[PDB]
Design a protein around this nucleic acid. Structure first.
Ligand code: NA
Length: 630
DNA sequence: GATCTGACGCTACGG
DNA sequence: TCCGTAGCGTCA
């Protein structure tokens, strides 16, 4: 009542006093209110309602009394996001003060606690619009209890606010987050908002304490938190795509699939659903009985084993390829389009490895290598990544770590041969093809690197022999070859497993952890699975750590530069994709390289490697075609 | 009739 | 019985 104020209705002296209160506050506690009015504190991840406003709890304490007189203590202030029916001058004014207040929220020196901070920052950024850039939110730090709880239990599904309260809050704290207009009144909604913001503060503090207990605090602060505005910035931008080229390509791939469907129906001597794996399985081994010649799955390995036995596996393979490209990287990419561009949604809570994930579309899952088709009424090369074009004038600058996890593995194992080892998988592919590097095909590399991946993480002789098309004897032989050549990899794995048995958990370089209780399981498949998972997590988690660190450091570096406008557009694990203004390319590519390479040594945390990190830079007007640089 | 959904298989991405 | 993301399609 005196605890809730619309900042538009404040007298100007009270407005000034409010700005000063925000500057001198002990902590800010924030949630987004929708038109329901519901909050991020309620249970839905998707409101399916518009954003109305933002509520901020201003805490004076985390000494003496206080009388402001225009508000009580501690006050909740409300900031209208939603546009009114008519735009006019008073709306302009309201917007001016609102932007001032929200920016105060962004730059304030006290702790900011927001349940989902990325959403908040995105909303604020889009609210700034023209009077602000992405560099305004760059330094924003805010305490996201969901991220903390994720660091503690990465496996657990993304919990609601109430879940987090019952789990991490002691004790007997019951919240009502479910109030809306129409199931309740405004006063109920608001009272509950204030109470739940207090509770949110308490919860977040408790979770911070826990994070310190588990040794996750420094990781939380240095790595996860500064990443929050970076995701929001990426979600605030959009990558322009070819609506037109894409519709064409769609039509073409549709024609070709019609062809392939007809062919398959022909050669199987029946009309079966071309997209059905069940029916294909029944045909391939149901009738044809190919396994007996020399049931199994329809998977690419099996289908490649049978490629000479019958014309159907090859047909099916090509069909699956073309159908995937069209259905997913064309048609499904056309449905993600707004205004001739797309924007992915980023999830920091998505993985157990500490990796980022992306949705609608998944831009981390876009096929790297273009595919070839025979046009039905010349050869036709189709690259989905070629559909992603930079704005004009602007150009994409890509920067990736070369063989990041191999180098991580070198660091962790300390294998002398590796530590010795101008290329990597061209070397091994050359050694396997019994020829130099220069004539080695990219597909040979594609298979080989995947095979070293298989063997290092504990793959058996079976799956090994399968993926490279090897008889078991060459399987065990190749296993022993690689593991005896580099001894310290098995030692490292054996150590990681031992650690996971000891602690009941396994830990990455920067302290990110993967609890694996089934390491203690009696079931042997479960136990072995937990072991594989631990061994993989040390490396993949460490690399996730490093990639996030690079992301943050480059973002920060560009953030304070007066010249450089470079915007981080996408991240694909090992790779950072920037949209840079043309004349800024040389100066930007320089800053990017120097920054990412300096990652070899950063204090804190001790964070030192045994191997330099080679950064590969690329540039181009399209994501599909990027010419190497420098 | 036209949908909803949980589970599985296969395909891409990335190491 | 390499790991683990998303996405699309069949099936009961
Ligand atoms: Na007014």
């Amino acid at each position: 009542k005196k605890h809730f104020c619309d900042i538009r209705h404040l007298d100007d002296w009270a407005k000034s006093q409010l700005i000063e209160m925000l500057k001198q506050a002990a902590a800010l506690v924030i949630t987004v209110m929708y038109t329901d009015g519901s909050t991020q504190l309620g249970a839905d991840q998707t409101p399916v309602s518009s954003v109305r406003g933002i509520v901020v709890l201003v805490k004076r304490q985390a000494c003496g009394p206080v009388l402001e007189g225009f508000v009580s203590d501690d006050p909740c202030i409300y900031i209208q996001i939603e546009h009114s029916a008519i735009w006019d001058q008073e709306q302009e004014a309201h917007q001016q003060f609102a932007r001032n207040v929200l920016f105060q929220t962004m730059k304030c020196k006290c702790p900011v606690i927001c349940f989902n901070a990325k959403d908040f920052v995105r909303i604020v950024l889009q609210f700034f619009g023209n009077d602000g850039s992405w560099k305004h939110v760059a330094d924003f730090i805010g305490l996201d209890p969901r991220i903390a709880a994720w660091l503690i239990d990465p496996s657990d599904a993304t919990p609601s606010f109430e879940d987090l309260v019952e789990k991490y809050c002691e004790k007997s704290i019951t919240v009502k987050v479910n109030s809306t207009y129409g199931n309740s009144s405004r006063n109920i909604v608001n009272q509950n908002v204030r109470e739940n913001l207090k509770t949110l503060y308490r919860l977040t503090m408790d979770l911070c304490s826990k994070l310190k207990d588990y040794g996750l605090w420094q990781l939380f602060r240095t790595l996860e938190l500064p990443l929050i505005p970076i995701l929001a910035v990426m979600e605030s931008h959009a990558i322009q795509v070819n609506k037109e080229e894409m519709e064409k390509t769609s039509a073409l791939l549709g024609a070709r699939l019609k062809e392939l469907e007809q062919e398959a129906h022909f050669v199987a001597g029946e009309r079966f659903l071309i997209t059905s794996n069940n029916q294909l399985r029944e045909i391939l081994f149901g009738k044809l009985k190919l396994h007996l010649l020399s049931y199994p799955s329809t998977s690419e390995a099996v289908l490649n084993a049978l490629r000479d036995l019958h014309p159907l596996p090859k047909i099916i393979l090509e069909y699956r390829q073309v159908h995937k490209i069209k259905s997913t990287f064309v048609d499904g990419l056309l449905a993600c389009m707004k205004k001739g561009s797309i924007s992915s949604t980023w999830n920091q809570t998505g993985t157990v490895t500490g990796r980022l994930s992306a949705k609608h579309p998944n831009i981390q899952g876009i096929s790297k290598h273009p595919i070839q088709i025979t046009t039905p009424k010349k050869i036709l090369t189709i690259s989905p990544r070629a559909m992603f074009v930079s704005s004009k004038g602007h150009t994409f600058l890509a920067a990736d770590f070369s063989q990041i996890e191999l180098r991580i593995l070198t660091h962790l194992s300390g294998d002398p041969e590796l530590l010795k080892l101008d290329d990597v998988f061209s070397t091994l592919t050359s050694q396997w093809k019994d020829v130099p590097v220069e004539q080695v095909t990219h597909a040979d590399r594609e298979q080989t690197k995947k095979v070293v991946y298989a063997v290092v993480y504990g793959a058996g002789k079976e799956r090994l022999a399968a993926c490279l098309g090897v008889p078991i004897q060459e399987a065990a032989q190749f296993l022993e070859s690689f593991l005896q050549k580099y001894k310290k990899i098995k030692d490292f794995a054996r150590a990681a497993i031992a650690q996971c048995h000891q602690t009941g958990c396994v830990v990455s370089i920067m302290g990110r952890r993967r609890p694996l209780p089934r390491i203690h399981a009696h079931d042997q498949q479960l136990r072995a699975q937990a072991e594989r998972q631990a061994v993989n997590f040390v490396v993949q988690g460490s690399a996730a750590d490093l990639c996030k660190l690079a992301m943050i450091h480059v973002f920060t570096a560009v953030a304070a530069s007066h010249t450089l406008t470079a915007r981080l557009v996408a991240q694909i694990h090992d790779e950072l994709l920037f949209e840079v203004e043309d004349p800024q390319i040389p100066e930007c590519a320089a800053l990017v390289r120097r920054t990412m390479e300096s990652l070899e040594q950063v204090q804190a945390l001790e964070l030192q490697l045994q191997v330099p990190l080679k950064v590969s830079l690329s540039a181009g007007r399209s994501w599909g075609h990027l010419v190497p640089l420098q």
